[PDB]
Amino acid sequence: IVGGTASVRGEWPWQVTLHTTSPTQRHLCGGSIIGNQWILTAAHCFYGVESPKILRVYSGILNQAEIAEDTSFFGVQEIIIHDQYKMAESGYDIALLKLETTVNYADSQRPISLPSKGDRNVIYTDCWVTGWGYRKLRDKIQNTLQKAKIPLVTNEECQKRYRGHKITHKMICAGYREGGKDACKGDSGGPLSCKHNEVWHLVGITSWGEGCAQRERPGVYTNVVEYVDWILEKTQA
Numbered sequence: 001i002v003g004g005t006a007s008v009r010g011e012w013p014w015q016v017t018l019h020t021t022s023p024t025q026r027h028l029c030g031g032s033i034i035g036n037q038w039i040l041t042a043a044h045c046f047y048g049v050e051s052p053k054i055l056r057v058y059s060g061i062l063n064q065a066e067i068a069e070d071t072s073f074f075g076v077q078e079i080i081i082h083d084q085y086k087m088a089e090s091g092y093d094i095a096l097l098k099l100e101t102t103v104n105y106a107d108s109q110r111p112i113s114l115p116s117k118g119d120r121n122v123i124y125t126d127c128w129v130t131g132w133g134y135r136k137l138r139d140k141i142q143n144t145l146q147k148a149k150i151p152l153v154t155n156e157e158c159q160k161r162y163r164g165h166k167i168t169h170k171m172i173c174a175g176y177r178e179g180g181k182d183a184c185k186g187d188s189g190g191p192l193s194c195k196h197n198e199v200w201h202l203v204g205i206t207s208w209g210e211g212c213a214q215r216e217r218p219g220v221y222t223n224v225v226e227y228v229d230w231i232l233e234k235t236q237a
């Protein structure tokens, strides 16, 4: 996260840090708890990943330092990538991780509600982007979970900032005309939490953009509301 600050412990209980153990353990992506055994994250976060076996999901984490060889984690039983996904920039950048065990909810780890199809004409206030991602073009995973308040931008406005791309209605962007605050490498899969009437909603999933926090270059996120049917279909046994 660029231009953000340290989050308070338990302030984003749905945020998880997804690690890979190969070659050696490290943070790979962010993700969101949406069900007792479900993590919603980004599809392009599994590039080169041929097995769920090297994955480890950690919940209720604030500082990466809390994670050691003796720290408990959730194994991943299955990785579900949208069958239409090809690459972040083309859309459908969404994936579901079915955990091997159930998450016992608590103040430190609980699910975030998905937006409703009726929440489309709703103006989201208090939108934040979080993660342990880079702080700059060429930085490194951050120890403390970072947070940054970032306003949503209309698709038409976003499209103007990405003439070479096609910003579809299945995407949603957020950023400042002058940049300064934005997601960066490592925040992918991270949730775009947004407040709607006192209730936190998972509006988007950190997907892509050009550089980090650059002027006139809004972050691009998967428009979650457009996938509620897909999520239901894939999570219902």
Ligand SMILES: *[B@@]1(C2=[C][C]=C([C][C][N]C([N])=[N])[C]=[C]2)O[C][C]([C][O])O1
Pocket: 028, 029, 044, 045, 133, 182, 183, 184, 185, 186, 187, 188, 189, 206, 207, 208, 209, 210, 211, 212, 213, 218, 219, 220
């Ligand atoms: B993501 C990731 C990669 C690159 C960026 C920078 C462009 N996006 C912006 N500025 N919003 C953000 C996030 O983090 C983990 C990796 C996994 O492949 O991708």
